[PDB]
């Protein structure tokens, strides 16, 4: 009864608004390193909403109407979902690229730092991010002096706080994919994530 009442209530509008606010707020907060705590708290709150969504998906059937409504809500807020997924996967790929040998031969400073120009050259050589993505990564990576960037701290700073929310999103997407087959809309989200 409570699940039906929530399904027929105005919860989906609040979820869509929260998704938009979360996407934009996390995108803005990722640039500054003095707001990290707030960002962490933001991430925690996001995870809780996903848990609630999972609680709405508990005890359903194949092609259930609740899952269909969840998919409709997701495709109603496609842009925010894509932005969040891009935020996750960009930082996921950044750590892998940092550990690559191409980056190791690209860095020439023996102090453990790297310039912005050489960082951009290494990322362009890797051929995994677009130009705006390079600009966003450069903006998020603070430079202490002479554009020196500590790639190790930059790569390791965004890993731990975003792990739980990413795992929850992956679980939710897997559940929706396995319980709503033959749905072309969800395949785009699956491919993106």
């Amino acid at each position: 009864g409570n699940q039906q009442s929530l399904a027929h209530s105005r919860l989906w509008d609040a979820v869509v608004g929260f998704l938009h606010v979360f996407a934009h707020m996390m995108m803005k907060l990722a640039q500054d390193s003095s707001q990290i705590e707030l960002l962490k708290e933001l991430l925690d709150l996001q995870k809780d909403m996903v848990v609630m969504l999972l609680s709405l998906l508990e005890g359903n059937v194949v092609n259930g109407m609740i899952a269909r409504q969840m998919v409709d809500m997701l495709v109603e807020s496609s842009s925010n979902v894509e932005m969040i997924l891009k935020f996750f996967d960009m930082f996921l790929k950044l750590k892998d690229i940092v550990g690559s040998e191409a980056f190791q031969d690209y860095v020439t400073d023996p102090r453990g730092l790297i310039s912005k120009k050489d960082f951009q050259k290494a990322m362009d050589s890797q051929k995994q991010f677009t130009g705006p993505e390079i600009q966003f990564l450069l903006s998020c990576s603070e430079a202490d002096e002479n554009e020196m960037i500590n790639f190790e701290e930059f790569a390791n700073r965004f890993q731990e706080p975003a792990r739980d929310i990413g795992f929850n999103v992956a679980v939710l997407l897997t559940n929706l994919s396995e319980h709503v087959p033959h749905d072309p809309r969800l395949r785009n989200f699956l491919e993106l994530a």
């Binding site: 690559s100 040998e101 191409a102 031969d105 050589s125 890797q126 051929k127 995994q128």
Partner: protein
């Protein structure tokens, strides 16, 4: 370890139907492992 000798030999794809395996491997892994390292490992010349 014995198969490491024919990695850079010019006659590596000899006696086998496909002769462009090294080029495909270069295209597949150059952006990650490094084009120069792949060329040195497989004994290829980019200009040639």
């Amino acid at each position: 370890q014995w198969d490491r000798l024919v990695l850079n030999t010019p006659s590596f794809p000899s006696n086998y139907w496909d002769k462009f395996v090294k080029r495909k491997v270069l295209d597949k892994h150059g952006d990650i492992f490094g084009r120069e390292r792949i060329a040195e490992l497989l004994g290829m010349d980019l200009a040639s």
